[PDB]
């Protein structure tokens, strides 16, 4: 739950560069994404982070994309908390993170402009492409807010938007012909830093987050640009200490962010019909 | 609010007596309490009495724009409400378990029977279609609901009257004066509810349980059978050992009953139609209005009406007259200087 | 014998039932989704992932939940919850003793039809403890007391409770403050690694006792890479572990 | 003569503060916010504090006297609302949360709660030991001057006490029992 | 205190309020017109530290099918946990709402503006009004604070012109803003606080209206056209007794009328 | 139009303004007005704080009537997380205080306007806070190359080349709440507002602590 | 449609639609199960008889307590809709779940214990209910909690004057002739039972029988999927 007798080691241990599980300080764990597992729509991924499970789907839509920005395409993210996700939050408990992450994933991809408002804009001012990225959480392996960063992108490279031709009306859809597909590595991501003393960590079990008041929100693209980044906590920090964690963002993120951003092909190569 | 308490013996013995295959309200195992039906002043209004349980049925008429897809068959809606005055424990909001199950459960067999046409209402498909909403209000609550609950609606559904005068091309016009004639409906099939209560391993089975019974019963089943001796829906609840076999009599037995029950709707449904065309007498219920005690009706005169109306000046003049001069003062108080 | 819950057992006279077994309509059925076990003149089932439910005097550590003006309520993985009341602690008196949520050792007096597990401490063998090393394991991953109550040559000494709960602490140097200070970076690597070492056996549906945990520890000689990747290494770890353990037997 | 919770004056080398206290590494920062006050100690140094407009702070004393108006009446238990733990107190925080028992409703006699102090009237009593095990306080009316002081008739009159165990209204005639 | 019941009235028996007022006291009456830029018509009125600002935004819609070319006026009376901690932390409060409609019923009992003028394109266009007023500090006559917050907030509204060219709508900000907002009738509302035996005070306070026993408000057109009368159970009454309220209300009406009429040449153009 | 690479609009603040709430706060920013009514400590093992966010149903040109649960969901929450470390919690065990704030107007930075206004009602009320929380606006012009701005206008923040709003505690420089949705620059390029951040708080830190005493005085001197 | 001994899906109206199930999946609960009725997917999880959690109030003593949540993937269906708004169904659904085990589960040895089982529809394709039924069933079998009998639910549709079992989705689209039941072969009691179709009072024996037997199969099927998971986990 949350004990002090134990919170003691937790903090020194992480400063000591001796996490808990034979991990130094900035150590991760075997994290994989299986792309497409929902035989019901475009983008699909099941990223299992430590002891957490996330799934994201995507589908396409036509017509009006809004009023002030008709000549384009924007994304819709709907998020869900699974009663199986939080043995705690039941029926009126999803609302929490369920609305929040829905917004955190909503702002990042919002300003990121890593969105082909172009590869999603039918008849501008009339028809536009709309994809719904939906989420579900099946567990919590700690740092779970990050697994969404991956399942949120990892499911995007597989968004084989259908090759659709409209002719005024008339609709043409080729199930065999899947080419009007859009996927780019401009896609943003999430990097968090919660402190465990002055030795701050990313991707740390809950037992671990348990020893901290705040964490840092950082977002980087393929290489290193920044999307929505924020400070998240009930406590406080020191700005001088901000730029350090801050850079930990472009610095550590791109690591497995780059190594993963690649794996999308690893599944696409050893299985064009094998899978 | 107030939790209607429940003795031990009361319950136990209530059962004791079921073990006796004897009904406490002294009836037989497959009978109904007498059920009455009163019709409203206006058309589309009704009241049901499953003998102590009371329901309210009201239907609505509208020219809404049908939905997307099959913009060719207008929609309809119904709602069932549980009142405070319904039961004590019926503080609006909590009983969902009933309002959930029941509202939906009920509403199921409605779209199940499709006993209601959805295109005959549809005037200008894709554009203006008709929306008929029906509302159920559980006035009093005693024993078997869903049944009076159904009756309520069906019974209601047949009485409502949709308007229509002249709509040509893409224009819509209807006048109550012409509406004095066209105003009927598409009641293809008429399904009803029959619940069966079980007692101790359903080794005893009751029908149309009263409130008290309602409590004592371990598990209950419902059934839906339209005049055409066929089902529409069934529902098992209160968890029991419902042997496919036995499940079978009830099913049967339910049909048996739905039979007669219908009789009434039509029966009275007719009796009502008759009165409008003859002597005339809409209203809510004069029957309870004539039966000795706890009710009275009489009509009384209005020159006591105009005699005093002139007194108004007396009190209007005597008082206010002297009361209006304080104004000269209020003119200058907060307005003049407030220019800041 | 293996049978799905709802089946039937050899019915004869002089037969008694166990947990997972019942009598229905003059017969015997398996209530629990388990396997068939017949020991003596008592029948019972084996369960895959059950809960805690020990016997006789028992030892387990609990995490603490809310405590009330006359008793302290602790948590223990089981259809049962563990609550101890001032009758063995060696209004605010309690608040100083057992804080909010803590890890405590215990002696188990008795669990009665009252459907509960009660606790009364006595020593540091049954004392409040602190540090930060708890193990969450199906309580079915236990052996016996005879081969229990031990400190092993690993740089630390560990205790596990008759439930699936194991705590790892460092050898004493002779009682609340004892650990209030951060132990050395050396004591830090013995236990932190033991963390990843203990999971595989479990992951590998393997037991967990002294001479057992010893060899799964010994096996650490090669892949010393302390943060043991759960799928790959551990896969091997037990292989060798049983290899060094089983050879001790046959 | 004012301070904001973000300015500092002295430090651990001169005084400690009770009011508006905020300290880090030895200096004096002001926790509270509103006004500044300094303290003089019988030790050759000063204590520092911010000013608590609410000079009135919790002060209901253990075995102390109080002014209270009854609430609910159980012919076995009696409930009350206390407002003045004497008079200086106006506090309404503890509002009316206090209990007394017949045994302590007097020192002699044996007259039921029902015949001592009713639901609506104000009563006076001293305080007994308090066991915040249930958020209640014990009080007594076992005094020659203690007891209850308020009297309302059936008509809506006020009553005077005709005796040690009575109050009455002049209008109608009610010979009633109340621990005067 | 739960005790001072009469205390408050002690002032009353010897007619006088612990406020320093008596039979009729239009205390601090202040308005800030158009104080809200990000709104086409606004008026803030704070009386005895209660703040109901009428924030009006306009929107374009479509007059009902039955009521072909009919304008659109929409009000909302809200009170958050602001004006008084003694308020809920969510959806509208019991009274919170009654007023909402009150204004509305008033809006409709008043005829202030003929829906006629709201229609952008008679039969396919309409002008929507959102006059949301919110009491920042609650305490006394939460009812009047609106008749004014609203009456004034409206005169503060001004919009361009309406045009449809080849199946399009042409209205530009810097268009022609005429008749911005003008109502042939400017009735206002007043609130009296009463006490059982009808000894009543006016412009009741948060506490005054509190231990009150009866509330009554009256709205009357300029010409003295009793818009609506409100009396959530007032201990009973007298036509004459009411007669006093009748006329003496008129008075506080002229005052406010002037209080606003005074913002005409000054706070309006300054 | 454009101005300084750090200019501040006029800073106007009179708090305690609220006669019904225990702690009051108000703001101005040549376009922003943010009110904060705070509620004492009540019980519902060491309690915390309650904060809420709302935006006038007429705060702009368009009319957002329903209390946009999502909109404020985050605005109130983050705000809570931000002001959150500001007050103590040990003086309110098993207690909870509520903080309410509405934005009548949005003068671009009205976001911080709230983070600020609220701070007032707090001590204004007189809570167990430690440091004061200061927030400001900081935008990056539409400019070709990196053209940077400090605290935008309702007309100005709408054409931003990035979106951010962050706060910190003056006196003890404590990272209040930094919230920006990346749009321009690299992990470092952000140090732009981060350093441009400590400027504002230190800057108004007085102008703020000053308006509190003004009322604290008018009230203090009142009784 | 469907005929000549070949239903529309392409299968004997008496032959179910192969289902594989992964039970005892995530081990971070206690009761875990995964399954798909051919092309209908959903995940059901239960947590042991933990002592009454949240809202310490309500707490049935004599016997345990039961809770079950049902929700479906917004795309699991054909298109996509609002799950927390169109609750009416789900909840209604959920209760159904509740009742079913609430009957068979043995809360008689878990006084005050509170067992919560939540289920989610991953890919929806007919017999939705019957799915989670077992889907849940298995979930518990995993959390091994004792239970009277092992139970599974089937569907039974009557079309072309004939009885079909497990009306997948397409046929669910029919005249709507569909009935389902939950069943405990133990003695064959009919735990739950919900039919919602306009059938005449006598295709029952038939349709009734249809699902009835159908379960009995689904049972033996999982009976193995289960008998297997016991021996291997036995290692």
For chain E, which residues make up each domain, given as ranges? 1-270
Q: How many CA atoms lie within 13 Å of A89's alpha carbon, on the beta-carbon side?
A: 16
CATH of the domain at B286: 3.30.230.70
CB distance G173 to G151 below 8 Å: no
In a mutational test of the A interface, the residue from F70, F175, F177, F201 whose CB has the highest number of chain A CBs within 10 Å is F175
Tokens 């400017």, residue? E186
Q: Which residues contact D112 (CB under 8 A, 6 or more apart)?
A: D75, D102
Q: Does the residue B315 lie in any domain? A: no
CB distance F170 to F202 below 8 Å: yes
C-alpha closest to that of F85 among A234, A197, A241, D23: A234
CB distance D17 to D48 below 8 Å: yes
Residues of chain F that touch chain A, judged by Cβ-Cβ distance less than 8 Å: 48, 69-70, 73-74, 77-78, 81, 84-85, 162-163, 166, 168-169, 173-191, 194, 197-198
Q: How far does chain B reach from its first CA to its final CA, in angstroms?
A: 55
The alpha carbon torsion through F170, F172, F177, F178 (nearest 10 deg) reads 80
Query: How far, in Å, CA of C133 to CA of C141, rounded?
Result: 17
Q: Which chains lie within 8 Å of chain C at 3 or more CB pairs, if any?
A: A, G
- Residue C61 and residue C18 share a domain: no
Nearest C-alpha in D relative to E3: D69
* Per-residue buried b or exposed e for D55-83, using 16+ beta carbons within 10 Å of the residue's own CB: eeeeebeeeebbbbbbeebeeeebbbbbb
Q: Does the residue B313 lie in any domain? A: no
**3 state DSSP class of F215:** helix
Number of CB pairs < 8 Å for B and G?
91
Please state the φ and ψ torsions of residue F8, each to the nearest 5 degrees.
-120, 140
Query: Which residues are bridge partners to E38 per DSSP?
Result: none
The domains of chain A, with CATH numbers, are 1-275 (3.30.230.70)
Write out the residue range of the structural domain in which residue F85 sits.
Answer: 1-223
CATH of the domain at C36: 2.40.50.100
Please state the φ and ψ torsions of residue B69, each to the nearest 5 degrees.
-15, -115
Displacement of CA D110 from its chain's centroid (Å): 27
Sign of CA dihedral B225, B231, B235, B236: positive
Task: With an 8 Å CB cutoff and a minimum of 3 pairs, decide whether chains D and A touch.
Answer: no
**3 state DSSP class of B78:** strand
Q: How far does chain A reach from its first CA to its final CA, in angstroms?
A: 40
Tokens 């007391």, residue? C145
Query: How far, in Å, CA of C119 to CA of F181, rounded?
Result: 53
Query: How far, in Å, CA of G230 to CA of G224, rounded?
Result: 10
Please state the φ and ψ torsions of residue G89, each to the nearest 5 degrees.
-65, -70
C-alpha closest to that of F180 among F142, F138, F150, F148: F138
Nearest C-alpha in B relative to G182: B236
CB distance G113 to G93 below 8 Å: no
Experimental approach: X-ray
Q: How far is G115 from chain A (nearest CA, A)?
A: 11
CB distance E36 to E130 below 8 Å: no
Extents of the domains making up chain G: 14-235
* Per-residue buried b or exposed e for A114-153, using 16+ beta carbons within 10 Å of the residue's own CB: bbbbeebbbeeeebbbbbbbbbbbbbbbbbbbbbbbbbbb
Q: How far is G179 from chain B (nearest CA, A)?
A: 9
D157: left (phi over 0), alpha (psi -120 to 50) or beta: beta
Q: Does the residue B329 lie in any domain? A: no
CB distance D95 to D81 below 8 Å: yes
From the list G147, G231, G233, which residue is nearest C5 (CB)?
Answer: G147
- Residue C77 and residue C153 share a domain: yes
The fourth-level CATH superfamily of domain E1-270 is GHMP Kinase, N-terminal domain (3.30.230.70)
- Residue C107 and residue C32 share a domain: no
Nearest C-alpha in A relative to C101: A3
In a mutational test of the D interface, the residue from E2, E7, E196 whose CB has the highest number of chain D CBs within 10 Å is E2
From the list B315, B326, B331, which residue is nearest E258 (CB)?
Answer: B331
Detail the DSSP E strand segments found in F4-123. 23-25, 33-42, 48-55, 96-105
Across the interface, do G48 and C79 touch by the CB < 8 Å criterion? Answer: yes
Q: Does the residue B320 lie in any domain? A: no
- Residue C40 and residue C158 share a domain: no
CB distance A112 to F182 below 8 Å: yes
Query: Which residues are bridge partners to B206 per DSSP?
Result: B197
Residues in chain G with CB shorter than 8 Å from the CB of C4 are: 141, 150, 223, 226-227
The domains of chain D, with CATH numbers, are 1-51 (2.40.50.100), 52-180 (2.40.50.140)
In a mutational test of the B interface, the residue from G90, G172, G173, G193 whose CB has the highest number of chain B CBs within 10 Å is G193
CB distance F30 to F9 below 8 Å: yes
- Residue C125 and residue C15 share a domain: no
Find the farthest-apart pair of alpha carbons in chain G and give their distance in angstroms, rounded. 60
Tokens 């830090």, residue? C188
Across the interface, do D32 and F130 touch by the CB < 8 Å criterion? Answer: no
CB distance G70 to G93 below 8 Å: yes
How open is the CA angle F6-F7-F8, to the nearest 5 degrees? Answer: 120
From the list C4, C25, C78, which residue is nearest G150 (CB)?
Answer: C4
Query: Which residues are bridge partners to E252 per DSSP?
Result: none
> Is residue C175 less than 8 Å (CB to CB) from chain G?
no
Nearest C-alpha in E relative to F37: E82
Task: With an 8 Å CB cutoff and a minimum of 3 pairs, decide whether chains B and G touch.
Answer: yes
Token code pair at residue A117: 């408002």
Q: Which residues contact C190 (CB under 8 A, 6 or more apart)?
A: C154, C155, C156, C170
Q: What is the DSSP letter of B29?
A: T
Query: How far, in Å, CA of D105 to CA of B322, rounded?
Result: 60
Cβ neighbours of B102 (radius 10 Å) = 22
CB interface of G with A, residues 129-188, below 8 Å: none
Burial class, C75, CB count within 10 angstroms (exposed 0-12 / middle 13-18 / buried 19+)? middle
CB distance B147 to B192 below 8 Å: yes
Across the interface, do A136 and G45 touch by the CB < 8 Å criterion? Answer: no
Across the interface, do A6 and C132 touch by the CB < 8 Å criterion? Answer: yes
Token code pair at residue G186: 């133990």
Query: Which residues are bridge partners to F35 per DSSP?
Result: F102
| Length of chain D (residues) | 180
Q: How far is E10 from chain F (nearest CA, A)?
A: 24
- Residue C243 and residue C169 share a domain: yes
How many structural domains does chain F have?
Answer: 1
Displacement of CA G102 from its chain's centroid (Å): 14
DSSP B172-207: -B--HHHHTS-----B---EEEEEEEE-TTTSSEEE
C-alpha closest to that of D24 among F119, F88, F194: F88
Q: How far is C33 from chain A (nearest CA, A)?
A: 22
C-alpha closest to that of B186 among B242, B115, B125: B115
CB distance F14 to F24 below 8 Å: no
Query: How far, in Å, CA of F157 to CA of E128, rounded?
Result: 28
CB distance E148 to E106 below 8 Å: no
CB distance E45 to E152 below 8 Å: yes
Across the interface, do E38 and F106 touch by the CB < 8 Å criterion? Answer: yes
From the list F48, F177, F184, which residue is nearest A231 (CB)?
Answer: F177
How many structural domains does chain B have?
Answer: 1
Please state the φ and ψ torsions of residue E25, each to the nearest 5 degrees.
-145, 80
Token code pair at residue D125: 């009593």
Cβ neighbours of D121 (radius 10 Å) = 16
What fold characterizes domain G14-235? Ribosomal Protein S5; domain 2 (3.30.230)
Q: What is the DSSP letter of E169?
A: B
From the list C4, C19, C31, which residue is nearest G148 (CB)?
Answer: C31
How many structural domains does chain C have?
Answer: 2
Tokens 């045994």, residue? D103
Write out the residue range of the structural domain in which residue C4 sits.
Answer: 1-55
Query: How far, in Å, CA of A202 to CA of A215, rounded?
Result: 9
> Could you tell me the CA-to-CA distances from C78 to C51, C126, G30 in Å, in that order?
4, 20, 11
**3 state DSSP class of B222:** strand
CB distance G208 to B248 below 8 Å: yes
Query: Which residues are bridge partners to E186 per DSSP?
Result: none
From the list E38, E78, E82, which residue is nearest F60 (CB)?
Answer: E38
Resolution (A): 3.3
Across the interface, do G149 and C205 touch by the CB < 8 Å criterion? Answer: no
C-alpha closest to that of F4 among F158, F113, F150: F150
Residues in chain C with CB shorter than 8 Å from the CB of A4 are: 99-100, 102, 130
> Could you tell me the CA-to-CA distances from G20 to B195, G17, G210, G225 in Å, in that order?
38, 10, 22, 8
Task: With an 8 Å CB cutoff and a minimum of 3 pairs, decide whether chains D and B touch.
Answer: no
From the list G39, G75, G118, which residue is nearest A84 (CB)?
Answer: G118
Q: What is the DSSP letter of G109?
A: G
Query: How far, in Å, CA of B46 to CA of B56, rounded?
Result: 6
DSSP G166-232: S--HHHHTSS---EEEEEBTTTTB---EEE-S--BTTSHHHHHHHHHHHHHHHHHHHHHHHHHHHHH
Write out the residue range of the structural domain in which residue B148 sits.
Answer: 3-302
Token code pair at residue B165: 């005068």
> Is residue G49 less than 8 Å (CB to CB) from chain C?
yes
Q: How many CA atoms lie within 13 Å of B228's alpha carbon, on the beta-carbon side?
A: 11
Residues in chain E with CB shorter than 8 Å from the CB of B330 are: 26, 251-252, 254-255
Q: Which residues contact G204 (CB under 8 A, 6 or more apart)?
A: B231, B248, B251
CB distance A77 to A134 below 8 Å: yes
Across the interface, do D22 and F216 touch by the CB < 8 Å criterion? Answer: no
Burial class, F120, CB count within 10 angstroms (exposed 0-12 / middle 13-18 / buried 19+)? buried
From the list C2, C6, C205, which residue is nearest G186 (CB)?
Answer: C6
Detail the DSSP E strand segments found in chain B. 36-39, 45-49, 54-59, 62-64, 76-82, 129-138, 191-198, 205-207, 220-226, 230-237
Q: How far is D157 from chain E (nearest CA, A)?
A: 15
Breaks (C-N over 2.5 A) in chain G follow: none
Token code pair at residue C179: 């650990």
| Length of chain E (residues) | 270
C-alpha closest to that of F141 among F191, F183, F198: F183
């Amino acid at each position: 739950t949350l004990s002090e007798a134990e919170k003691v080691y937790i903090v020194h241990g992480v400063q000591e560069d001796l996490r808990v599980d034979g991990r130094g300080c900035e150590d991760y764990r075997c994290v994989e994404v299986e792309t497409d597992v929902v035989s019901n729509t475009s983008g699909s991924a099941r990223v299992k982070l430590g002891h957490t499970d996330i799934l994201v789907g995507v589908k396409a839509e036509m017509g009006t994309p809004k009023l002030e920005k008709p000549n384009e395409g924007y994304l819709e993210f709907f998020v869900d908390c699974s009663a199986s996700a939080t043995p705690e939050f039941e029926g009126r408990g999803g609302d929490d993170l369920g609305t929040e992450i829905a917004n955190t994933l909503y702002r990042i991809f919002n300003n990121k402009s890593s969105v082909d408002l172009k590869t999603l804009c039918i008849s501008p001012r009339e028809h536009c492409w709309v994809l719904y990225v939906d989420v579900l959480l099946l567990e919590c392996g700690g740092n779970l807010f990050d697994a969404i960063s991956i399942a949120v992108k990892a499911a995007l490279f597989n968004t084989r938007i259908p090759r659709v031709r409209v002719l005024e009306d008339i609709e043409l859809s080729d199930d065999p012909y899947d080419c009007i597909r859009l996927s780019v590595e401009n896609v943003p991501c999430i990097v968090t830093l919660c402190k465990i003393g002055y030795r701050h960590v990313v991707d740390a079990t809950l037992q671990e987050e348990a020893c901290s008041l705040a964490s840092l929100l950082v977002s980087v693209t393929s290489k290193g640009v920044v999307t929505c980044m924020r400070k998240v906590g009930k406590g406080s920090l020191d700005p001088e200490s901000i730029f350090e964690m801050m850079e930990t963002g472009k610095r550590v993120g791109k690591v497995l962010h780059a190594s993963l951003q690649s794996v999308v092909h690893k599944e696409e190569s050893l299985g064009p019909k094998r899978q | 609010m107030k939790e209607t308490p429940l003795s031990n013996c009361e319950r136990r013995f209530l059962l004791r007596a079921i073990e006796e295959k004897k009904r406490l309200d002294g009836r037989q195992t497959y009978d109904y309490r007498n059920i009455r039906i009163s019709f409203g002043t206006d058309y589309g209004c009704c009241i049901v009495e499953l003998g102590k349980t009371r329901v309210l049925g009201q239907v609505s008429c509208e020219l809404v724009s049908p939905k997307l897809n099959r913009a060719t068959e207008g929609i309809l809606f119904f709602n069932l409400e549980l009142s405070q005055m319904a039961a004590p424990a019926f503080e609006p909001g909590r009983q969902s378990d009933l309002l959930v199950k029941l509202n939906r459960l009920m509403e199921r067999c409605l779209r199940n029977s499709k006993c209601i046409d959805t295109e005959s209402l549809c005037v200008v498909a894709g554009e203006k279609v008709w929306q008929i909403r029906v509302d159920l209000h559980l006035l009093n609550h005693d024993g078997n609901i869903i049944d009076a609950a159904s009756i309520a609606a069906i019974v209601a559904l047949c009485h409502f009257r949709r308007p229509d005068v002249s709509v040509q091309g893409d224009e819509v016009t209807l006048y109550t004066p012409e509406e004095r004639d066209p105003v009927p409906l598409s009641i293809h099939h008429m399904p009803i509810c029959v619940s069966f209560a079980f007692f101790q391993q359903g080794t005893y089975l009751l029908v149309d349980p009263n409130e008290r019974e309602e409590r004592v019963m371990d598990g209950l089943l419902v059934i839906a059978m339209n005049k055409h001796r066929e089902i529409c829906t069934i529902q098992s609840s209160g968890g029991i050992m419902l042997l496919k076999d036995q499940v079978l009599r009830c099913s049967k037995i339910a049909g048996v009953k739905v039979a007669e029950i219908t009789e009434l709707i039509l029966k009275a449904l007719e009796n009502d139609q008759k009165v409008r065309k003859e002597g005339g007498k809409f209203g809510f219920a004069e029957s309870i209005a004539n039966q000795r005690i706890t009710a009275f009706k009489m009509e009384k005169a209005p020159x006591x009406x105009x005699x005093x109306x002139x007194x108004x000046x007396x009190x209007x003049x005597x008082x206010x007259x002297x009361x209006x001069x304080x104004x000269x003062x209020x003119x200058x108080x907060x307005x003049x200087x407030x220019x800041x | 014998h293996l049978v799905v819950p709802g089946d039937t057992i050899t019915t004869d006279t002089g037969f008694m039932r166990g947990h997972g077994t019942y009598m229905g309509e003059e017969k015997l059925i398996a209530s629990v989704a388990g396997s068939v076990e017949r020991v003596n003149k008592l029948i019972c089932v084996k369960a895959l992932k059950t809960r805690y439910i020990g016997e006789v005097g028992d030892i387990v550590v609990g995490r603490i939940t809310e405590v009330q003006q006359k008793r302290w309520k602790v948590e223990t993985n089981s259809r049962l919850d563990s609550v101890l009341l001032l009758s063995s602690m060696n209004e605010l008196a309690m608040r100083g003793f057992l804080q909010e949520g803590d890890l405590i050792s215990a002696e188990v007096q008795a669990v009665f039809s009252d459907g509960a597990v009660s606790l009364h401490t006595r020593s540091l063998k049954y004392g409040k403890l602190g540090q930060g090393v708890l193990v969450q394991v199906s309580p079915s991953l236990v052996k016996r007391q005879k081969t229990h109550f031990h400190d092993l040559p690993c740089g630390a000494s560990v205790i596990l409770g008759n439930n699936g709960f194991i705590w790892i602490y460092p050898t004493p140097e002779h009682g609340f403050i004892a650990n209030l200070e951060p132990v050395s970076l050396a004591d830090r690597e013995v236990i932190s690694r033991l963390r990843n070492c203990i999971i595989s056996l479990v992951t590998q549906r393997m037991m967990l006792y002294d001479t057992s945990i010893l060899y799964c520890y010994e096996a650490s000689l090669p892949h010393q890479i302390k943060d043991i990747l759960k799928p790959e290494i551990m896969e091997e770890i037990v292989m060798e572990t049983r290899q060094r353990l089983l050879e001790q037997e046959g | 003569r004012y301070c904001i919770p973000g300015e500092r004056l002295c430090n651990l080398e001169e005084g400690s503060p009770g009011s508006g206290t905020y300290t880090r590494h030895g200096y004096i920062f002001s926790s509270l916010a509103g006004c500044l006050m300094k303290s003089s100690e019988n030790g050759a140094l000063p204590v520092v504090s911010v000013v608590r407009e609410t000079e009135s702070q919790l002060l209901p004393d253990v075995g102390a006297i109080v002014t209270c108006k009854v609430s609910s009446i159980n012919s076995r238990f009696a409930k009350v609302h206390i407002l003045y733990v004497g008079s200086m107190p106006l506090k309404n925080s503890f509002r009316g949360t206090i209990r007394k028992e017949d045994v302590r409703a007097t020192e002699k006699d044996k007259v039921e709660i029902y015949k001592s102090f009713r639901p609506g009237d104000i009563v006076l009593a001293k305080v007994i030991s308090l066991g915040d095990a249930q958020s209640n306080y014990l009080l007594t009316t076992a005094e020659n001057e203690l007891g209850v002081v308020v009297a309302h008739s059936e008509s809506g009159i006020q009553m005077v006490p005709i005796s040690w165990c009575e109050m009455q209204c002049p209008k109608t005639h009610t010979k009633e029992f109340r621990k005067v | 205190t739960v005790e001072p019941l009469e205390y408050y009235r002690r002032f009353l028996k010897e007619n006088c309020r612990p406020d320093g007022r008596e039979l009729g006291e239009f205390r601090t009456t202040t308005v800030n017109i158009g104080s809200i830029s990000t709104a086409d018509g606004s008026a803030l009125v704070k009386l005895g530290n209660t703040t109901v600002i009428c924030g009006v935004k306009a929107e374009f819609a479509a007059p009902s099918t039955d009521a072909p070319d009919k304008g659109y006026v929409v009000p909302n009376v809200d009170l958050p946990p602001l004006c008084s901690s003694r308020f809920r932390s969510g959806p509208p409060g019991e009274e919170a709402q009654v007023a909402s409609q009150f204004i509305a019923d008033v809006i409709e009992n008043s005829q202030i503006i003929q829906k006629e003028d709201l229609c952008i394109s008679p039969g396919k266009l309409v002008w929507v009004l959102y006059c949301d007023l919110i009491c920042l500090d609650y305490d006394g006559n939460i009812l009047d604070a609106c008749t004014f917050a609203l009456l004034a907030a409206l005169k503060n509204v001004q919009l361009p012109e309406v045009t449809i060219n080849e199946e399009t709508a042409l209205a530009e900000v810097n268009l022609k803003k005429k008749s911005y907002l003008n109502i042939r009738t400017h009735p206002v509302a007043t609130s009296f606080a009463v006490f059982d035996d009808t000894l009543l005070i006016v412009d009741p306070t948060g506490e005054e209206e509190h231990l009150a026993t009866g509330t009554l408000t009256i709205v009357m057109d300029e010409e003295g056209k009793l818009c609506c009368l409100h009396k959530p159970g007032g201990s009973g009454l007298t036509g004459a007794k009411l007669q006093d309220c009748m006329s003496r209300a008129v008075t506080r009406h002229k005052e406010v009328k002037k209080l606003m009429d005074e913002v005409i040449k000054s706070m309006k153009p300054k | 139009g454009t101005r300084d690479p750090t200019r501040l609009r006029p800073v106007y603040a009179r708090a305690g303004l609220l006669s019904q709430a225990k702690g009051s706060a108000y703001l101005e920013a040549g376009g922003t007005k943010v009110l904060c009514a705070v509620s004492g400590p009540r019980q519902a093992l060491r309690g915390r704080l309650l904060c809420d966010f709302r935006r006038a149903p007429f705060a702009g040109r368009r009319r957002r009537a329903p209390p946009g649960g999502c909109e404020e969901r985050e605005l109130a929450l983050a705000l809570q997380e931000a002001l959150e470390p500001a007050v103590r919690l040990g003086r309110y065990p098993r207690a909870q205080l509520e903080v309410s704030a509405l934005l009548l107007e949005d003068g671009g930075s009205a976001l911080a306007a709230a983070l600020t206004a609220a701070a007032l009602a707090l001590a204004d009320a007189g809570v167990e806070m430690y440091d004061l929380v200061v927030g400001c606006g900081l935008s990056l012009a539409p400019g070709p190359a990196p053209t940077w701005l400090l605290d935008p206008t309702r007309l100005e923040e709408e054409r931003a080349a990035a979106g951010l709003t962050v706060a910190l505690m003056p006196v003890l420089n404590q990272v209040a709440g930094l919230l920006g949705s990346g749009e321009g620059g690299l992990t470092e390029s952000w140090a732009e507002a981060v350093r441009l951040g400590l400027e504002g708080c230190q800057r108004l830190y007085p102008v703020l602590q000053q308006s509190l005493v003004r009322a604290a005085r008018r009230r203090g001197a009142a009784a | 449609l469907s005929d000549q001994g070949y239903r529309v899906d392409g299968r004997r109206a008496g032959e179910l639609r192969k289902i594989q199930a992964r039970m005892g999946v995530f081990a971070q609960a206690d009761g875990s199960a995964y399954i798909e009725q051919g092309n209908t997917k959903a995940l059901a999880v239960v947590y042991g008889p933990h002592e009454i959690r949240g809202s310490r109030a309500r707490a049935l003593p004599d016997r345990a307590l039961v809770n079950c949540q049902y929700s479906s993937a917004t795309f699991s269906t054909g298109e996509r809709k609002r799950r927390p708004h169109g609750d009416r169904k789900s909840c209604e659904m959920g209760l159904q779940l509740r009742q079913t085990f609430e009957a068979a589960i043995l809360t008689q040895l878990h006084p005050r214990s509170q067992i919560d089982i939540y289920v989610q529809v991953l890919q929806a394709d007919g017999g939705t209910y019957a799915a989670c039924v077992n889907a849940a069933t298995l979930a518990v079998l995993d959390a091994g909690i004792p239970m009277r009998d092992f139970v599974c639910a089937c569907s039974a549709g009557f079309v072309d004057g004939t009885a079909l079992a497990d009306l997948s989705h397409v046929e669910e689209a029919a005249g709507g002739p569909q009935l389902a039941l939950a069943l405990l072969p133990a003695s064959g009691q009919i735990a739950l039972l919900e039919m919602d179709a306009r059938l005449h009072e006598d295709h029952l024996e038939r349709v009734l029988e249809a699902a009835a037997q159908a379960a009995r199969d689904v049972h033996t099927l999982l009976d193995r999927v289960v008998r297997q998971h016991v021996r291997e986990a036995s290692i």
